[PDB]
Amino acid sequence: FMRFRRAFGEYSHVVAFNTLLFLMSFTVLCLTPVYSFLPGVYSVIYLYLT
Amino acid sequence: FMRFRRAFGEYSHVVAFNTLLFLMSFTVLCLTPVYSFLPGVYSVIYLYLT
């Protein structure tokens, strides 16, 4: 984490959350084909959390 | 963008807008031969925006 903070300057904070949200969305999309409940409730949770 | 900000010192801000305006003007000049309306209205918009 120190090595990561050495680069990317001030924008490391923006990059980290953008990557984490993308990873979470990718995981949700991967779990979509079996669990059909996710697209609605996860979207509502994301709207609440944002 | 971090790599670009590493160089050019304090004048990166002046260089960026100067390059963007030059690119926009070049695009407008490229669209000139077909759309004859551009030289006047774009000049007025540029004067307003400056």
Query: CA of A10, closest CA in chain B: separation in Å?
Result: 8
Instruction: Give the pair of three-digit tokens for residue A40.
Output: 């609605």
Q: Reduce the DSSP state of residue B7 to 3 states and report it.
A: coil
- Residue type present at position A9: G
Experimental technique used to determine this entry:
cryo-EM
The chain B residue lying nearest A12, using CA atoms, is B2
A3's tokens: 């090595």
Answer yes or no: are the C-beta atoms of B39 and B47 closer than 8 Å.
Answer: no
Q: Does A4 touch chain B (CB under 8 A)?
A: no
Phi, psi of A32 (to 5 degrees): -60, -45
Chain B: residue whose CA lies nearest to A10: B2
B14/B47 Cα distance (integer angstroms): 19
Chain breaks in chain A (C to N over 2.5 A) after: none
Q: Measured between beta carbons, which residues in chain A are less than 8 angstroms from residue B5?
A: 9
**What is the stated resolution of the deposited model, in angstroms?**
4.2
